[PDB]
């Protein structure tokens, strides 16, 4: 611990903002949007240091962020972008922390507001217009207020939307005769932009035994759903795919797609089923639907890490390192290590200054390079999810 527990000392205000295409109907519309943004607003008791921390409980029913996983949260600013305190997230007990930097120890009367956006659990608010109790704890205060979330799961031939996204791959969801129509010929052909298959693996097909098994939140109970066995798929040289699925008569089916992430892709990806069919008068058709998301694959797990490394121009063992916002304020401190190694981890993705603390009558040799800045020698970084720029500095006597 780098502190301690300050929810007592941390006095918050709570309030919930519906975002998106349900906002004038008072509803989250998943597919149209739609977030819960929770605005919080908190003065802090002076004697709060840096490293102390207050904690967010999101409680049962929703998590920070909206599709990419796992989810994280941003640090908290003061009104000229300076960091108050950093924000981690911890999956298992849907819990944010805020860790106060040394902004607490500069400044007194501290006090801010932040934003965080939010979605439900797609396997617990399940069904549209689900209002649920919308319970979190605010640095140890619990605020609720009942929350309606629709899906706009309608009952059609073909529609789908995503489950969720990670750097790696989506889990796209389809939806295959829900209106339950006489359909033969059935071929249902999944596509992307920024998103490509690569083999059948990548997809699962289930026949629903009932209606009940189309989830309205598109994130079905596939445990409970067997897999049609020996599914006909077929990969297609423009990085689509195409599933028959044969003379389906009125029965209903669901396909549970894993599309990959696109190396270098920036943008608004899609992902869209089309699904093609001839119904009980002989007439063929194809109906189709998609959904966009906004990703940069290069951003999308959103923190990484650097390091490097610090010698007398000898490794210098023991040489203090931070790590600070760009205006200066500390968020993190190490040390090199006896081979003069230093790292830092788990940063979310955004610009930072590197600060080597010289020893009495040492001067950096001679971006990544260290020059001396505000009274600090200092190098920048900026980091992403991988490949960032080793920072090393070479020192010598003044």
């Avoid at 966009?292 to 210098?316: K, P």
């Amino acid at each position: 611990q780098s502190g301690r527990n300050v929810n007592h000392l941390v006095f918050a205000n709570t309030s919930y903002e519906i975002l998106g295409g349900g906002k004038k109907y008072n509803q989250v519309f998943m597919t149209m949007d739609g977030k819960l943004k929770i605005k919080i607003d908190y003065t802090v008791d002076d004697s709060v240091v840096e490293g102390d921390y207050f904690t967010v409980d999101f409680g049962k029913y929703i998590h920070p962020g909206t599709s990419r996983k796992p989810y994280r949260v941003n640090n908290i600013h003061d009104a000229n972008g300076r960091t108050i305190a950093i924000g981690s997230y911890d999956s298992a007990t849907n819990t944010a922390k805020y860790t106060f930097t040394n902004y607490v120890d500069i400044y007194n009367n501290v006090r801010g507001s932040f934003s965080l956006l939010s979605w439900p659990f797609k396997e617990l608010v399940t069904t549209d217009k689900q209002s649920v109790p919308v319970g979190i704890t605010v640095a140890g205060e619990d605020y609720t207020q009942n929350v309606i979330f629709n899906y706009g799961n309608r009952t059609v031939p073909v529609i789908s939307d995503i489950n969720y996204l990670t750097k790696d791959f989506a889990e796209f969801t389809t939806y295959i005769n829900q209106n339950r129509a006489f359909n033969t010929g059935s071929k249902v052909r999944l596509s992307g932009q920024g998103f490509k298959f690569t083999s059948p693996d990548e997809i699962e097909v289930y026949k629903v035994l009932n209606n009940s098994q189309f989830r309205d939140s598109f994130s079905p109970d596939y445990a409970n759903l067997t897999q049609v066995r020996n599914p006909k798929i077929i990969i297609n040289s423009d990085g689509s795919a195409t599933v028959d699925l044969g003379d389906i008569g009125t029965l209903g089916y669901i396909i549970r797609s894993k599309p990959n992430t696109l190396p270098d892709f920036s943008g608004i990806g899609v992902l869209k089923s089309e699904y093609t069919f001839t119904n009980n008068k002989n007439q063929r058709d194809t109906r189709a639907h998609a959904s966009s998301i906004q990703f940069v694959r290069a951003e999308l797990a959103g923190f990484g890490g650097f390091g490097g490394y610090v010698w007398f121009d000898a490794a210098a063992a023991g040489i203090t390192v931070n790590l600070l916002d760009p205006t200066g304020i500390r968020l993190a401190t190490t040390t090199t290590d006896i081979t003069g190694h230093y790292n830092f981890d788990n940063l979310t993705n955004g610009n930072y200054l590197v600060e080597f603390v010289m020893p009495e009558g040492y001067i950096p040799t001679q971006d990544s390079d260290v020059v001396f800045e505000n009274g600090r020698y200092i190098a920048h970084v900026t980091i992403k999810d991988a490949d960032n720029m080793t920072i090393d500095a070479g020192l010598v006597s003044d």
